[PDB]
Design a protein around this ligand. Structure first.
Ligand code: FMN
Length: 368
């Protein structure tokens, strides 16, 4: 079974290829990592396994969900360390995903109820609704488009948060540049309507993610930096006229960064879309294989993977590691279960974003 052949990700000797995909669960009350996170990650950690934390705040204006952890204050760093220690004690490797939502926020999540920032002034449409602190859904407001100087301030927040992640003990960080968020808002031409040097051409649209990656690399080293993108996913009205072209454009910038920096990134992480048929290589698969073949380094595929699809991905060389989200929610021992090809617990979406430290978070049973 390919999923269980070792894999050397940089200095990390991974015993298997099943990865915990970053997942927002909203248990980090008031943005403070909670002991619950500790038990949650500990349950899923395995000797030689790779975990990626839920997206984490890089500043006071980077959140668009309630109770998501942050890593921009020393207090948060202190609490993250305890979680990182419990995970390391299991022999797992763990990276902290640095996340800024951009225009996908609401005044309720912004200091002084200010407007969320973005590359544009256009708001997400009403086809998408934001989750509110009280569990109901809200309207995405008009964001404020930032200038060159402010862009550099946000880049600095990523930088500072990356240093904090390292101070907390994390083995590295993952730059969240997918799913229609801040970075993705500069990447997708369906959103980026700028006329300055951060908009228009592929090179300009790629500038922001490049500056962000460069800043953290120069701060903690390319080896402790992973990057996540999703050119073919349009979540939150984040579409591009040419998904494949945009992805390759991003891949080229990353390869260039590695060559100039003289070191490879931890990995490239890509979320893929899944079409829907009926009672059930292809464009989508080929787009993924193409980004993988173009990228000089470790490739992590994600999005609707199963035990079967995962084995296939590693077996055909389409990916080095496979990240699982939803199945990892309901199966703390997903790695063991996949290895023994045992049944899988179904996940209850109702408690994906509730605040209880146990219910729908750590009370999913292990294999008996
Ligand atoms: C409840 C939930 C929360 C998620 N939170 C994040 C997140 O904070 N950052 C991110 O990059 N992806 C996030 N994802 C996407 C996952 O990392 C992963 O790409 C996706 O779950 C893969 O598909 P799967 O659920 O079929 O395995 C989330 C997914 C779910 C279901």
């Amino acid at each position: 079974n390919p999923l269980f052949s070792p894999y050397k990700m940089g200095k990390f000797n991974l015993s298997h290829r099943v990865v915990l995909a970053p997942m927002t669960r909203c248990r980090a009350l008031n943005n403070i990592p909670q002991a619950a996170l500790g038990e949650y990650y500990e349950q899923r950690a395995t000797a030689g396994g790779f975990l990626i934390t839920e997206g984490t705040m890089i500043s006071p204006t980077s959140a668009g969900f309630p109770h998501v952890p942050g890593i921009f204050t020393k207090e948060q760093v202190r609490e993250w360390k305890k979680i990182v220690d419990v995970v390391h004690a299991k022999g797992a490797v763990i990276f902290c995903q640095l996340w800024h939502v951009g225009r996908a926020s609401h005044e309720v999540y912004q200091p002084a109820g200010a407007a969320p920032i973005s590359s544009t002034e256009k708001p997400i449409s009403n086809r998408w609704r934001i989750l509110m602190p009280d569990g109901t859904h809200g309207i995405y407001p008009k964001p404020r488009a930032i200038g060159t100087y402010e862009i550099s301030q946000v880049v600095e927040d990523y930088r500072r948060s990356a240093l904090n992640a390292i101070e907390a003990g994390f083995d590295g960080i993952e730059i969240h540049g997918a799913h229609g968020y801040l970075i993705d808002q500069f990447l997708k031409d369906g959103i980026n309507d700028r006329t300055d040097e951060y908009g228009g051409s592929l090179a300009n649209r790629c500038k922001f993610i490049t500056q962000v990656v460069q800043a953290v690399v120069s701060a903690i080293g390319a080896d402790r930096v992973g990057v996540r993108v999703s050119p073919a996913i349009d979540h939150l009205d984040a579409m591009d006229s040419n998904p494949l072209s945009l992805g390759l454009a991003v891949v080229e910038r990353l390869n260039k960064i590695q060559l100039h920096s003289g070191s490879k990134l931890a990995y490239l992480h890509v979320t893929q879309p899944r079409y829907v048929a009926y009672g059930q290589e292809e464009e989508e698969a080929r787009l993924m294989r193409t980004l993988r073949n173009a990228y000089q380094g470790t490739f992590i595929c994600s999005g609707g993977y199963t035990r079967e699809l995962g084995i296939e991905a590693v077996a055909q060389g389409d990916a080095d590691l496979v990240s699982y989200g939803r199945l990892f929610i309901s199966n703390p021992d997903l790695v063991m279960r996949i290895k023994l090809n045992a049944p899988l617990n179904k996940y209850n979406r109702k408690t994906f974003y509730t605040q209880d430290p146990v219910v729908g978070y750590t009370d999913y049973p292990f294999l008996q």
